[PDB]
Design a protein around this ligand. Structure first.
Ligand SMILES: NC(=O)c1ccc[n+]([C@@H]2O[C@H](COP(=O)([O-])OP(=O)(O)OC[C@H]3O[C@@H](n4cnc5c(N)ncnc54)[C@H](OP(=O)(O)O)[C@@H]3O)[C@@H](O)[C@H]2O)c1
Ligand SMILES: NC(=O)c1ccc[n+]([C@@H]2O[C@H](COP(=O)([O-])OP(=O)(O)OC[C@H]3O[C@@H](n4cnc5c(N)ncnc54)[C@H](OP(=O)(O)O)[C@@H]3O)[C@@H](O)[C@H]2O)c1
Lengths: 239, 239
């Protein structure tokens, strides 16, 4: 089992914390060559070093701030990747901003715009930049991260709900365009023990939640060979 | 029938052309006091004058460019409305930008951002500004405009599909927050004979399409009293 992802090159955004960190570390343990994207340099250095402890292979990391990056910035990142890696076998878009959790009448419009910029616009721009590398895979897998409020909007979820709906739509468009070329799917992690969840639910007991490690089976499956015919779908990590 | 919307004050965005123009004119014919929002001053003047021909009542219009308006701009507009109108009984968010219809790899990121800004962000900001007026209605009705690609993403629909998914999500959040206070719903017009449709489908015969006038029954129903218990739903004008 331990070589499930041997010779698969997988890029993970939001790899500096929470679910993305766990995904990057888990993929590396299963033999993948991982590329870490994040915003916080110190956190990325820490994750890369912990992957080196666990696997003896030190992954490369890149800084890309999704709030402010331009299309040119994403293209430049892709060019830097091309120098060291001949393809991408997987891209996991896990980075996300929660924004305000409060009624629509109280949503801060600057924060609303930021949520849309990171979760949707920059996620799209990065996708555009990385598509040529993904198409070089024998069976590239592109994964977006949704939420239950990306399937059914609920009170107080504001920009986050709008952005995760947009994410499902973007995934569906891409799956349709890349039939028999790429697998394109969404994962809904479910409520998971991270800082984002704790901010969204400040009074909930985090010990009642599954951890990122607990929800990894779906993350592995989508990057492995058993999911090869599956595209255009949204999967719940906690069904 | 001709006084169905007597003493209902209804604001319509994108009232300068296409479906929005038809909705504004139709609501006025049924007795509504209509407020026209658009970008093109000459078109708004023309629609207001044609409403005056048809009803002998000249509606007010306001310019608000959804690409560049700030939250402050929307608040200022709401203040201007408050001067002349004590409430809003309906708000129809019909304005929209199509953006590029082409594969994801060819989508222009500036255009993508514009589509998200008009269809989602400024639509949200305007909603925030108008909510207090809507809450003054005995039964306020807030209507967003979706598309079939806001329910199922398809190839080439890019930012537009993402934005209409976000629109469905925003509608669902609002419906949940305003239970037994407002009706909040989406209309999917279906393929309708307008300039937007003709650009999206340049080779299609527009005479094969229903016109905006043809799809008005649903637009009237959502503003009239027979839809009073209906919220959180998306309705197809062409089922
Ligand atoms: N935890 C849950 O219950 C839950 C449920 C449903 C969906 N999700 C989704 O799961 C994904 C991961 O979230 P999480 O719970 O693991 O939260 P998290 O621990 O706070 O991690 C979020 C990650 O996103 C990155 N990120 C945020 N803003 C960024 C920006 N401007 N530029 C680049 N990267 C940015 C962060 O990077 P830096 O630390 O380097 O700033 C961090 O690595 C998100 O898409 C979230 O919506 C989580
Ligand atoms: N026609 C269809 O087959 C179809 C199908 C599904 C959904 N829809 C939806 O129906 C709605 C109406 O579209 P339509 O077909 O009637 O197209 P249309 O004739 O081109 O009308 C679009 C309206 O949106 C307004 N608008 C565009 N950009 C704006 C901006 N930056 N600021 C303020 N207003 C702006 C335009 O105003 P100005 O003219 O003043 O610039 C125009 O009044 C849209 O939401 C569209 O997505 C249409």
């Amino acid at each position: 089992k331990q070589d499930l992802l041997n010779d698969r090159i997988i890029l993970v955004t939001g790899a500096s914390d929470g679910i993305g960190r766990e995904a990057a570390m888990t993929y590396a343990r299963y033999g993948a060559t991982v590329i870490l994207l994040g915003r916080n340099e110190e956190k990325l250095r820490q994750v890369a070093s912990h992957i080196n402890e666990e696997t003896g292979r030190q992954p490369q990391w890149f800084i890309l701030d999704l709030l402010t990056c331009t299309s040119e910035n994403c293209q430049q990142l892709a060019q830097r990747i091309v120098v060291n890696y001949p393809r991408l076998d997987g891209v996991l878009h896990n980075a996300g901003l929660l924004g305000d959790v409060c009624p629509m009448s109280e949503q801060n419009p600057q924060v609303w715009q930021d949520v849309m910029q990171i979760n949707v616009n920059a996620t799209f721009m990065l996708t555009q930049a990385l598509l040529p590398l993904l198409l070089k895979s024998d069976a590239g897998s592109l994964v977006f991260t949704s939420s239950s409020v990306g399937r059914q909007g609920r009170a107080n979820w504001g920009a986050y709900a709008a952005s995760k709906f947009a994410t499902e739509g973007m995934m569906q468009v891409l799956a349709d365009e890349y039939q028999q070329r790429l697998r394109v799917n969404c994962i809904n992690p479910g409520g998971t023990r991270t800082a984002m969840r704790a901010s969204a639910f400040p009074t909930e007991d985090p010990q009642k939640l599954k951890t990122p490690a607990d929800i990894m089976p779906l993350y592995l499956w989508l990057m492995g060979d058993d999911s090869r015919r599956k595209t255009g779908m949204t999967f719940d990590a906690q069904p």
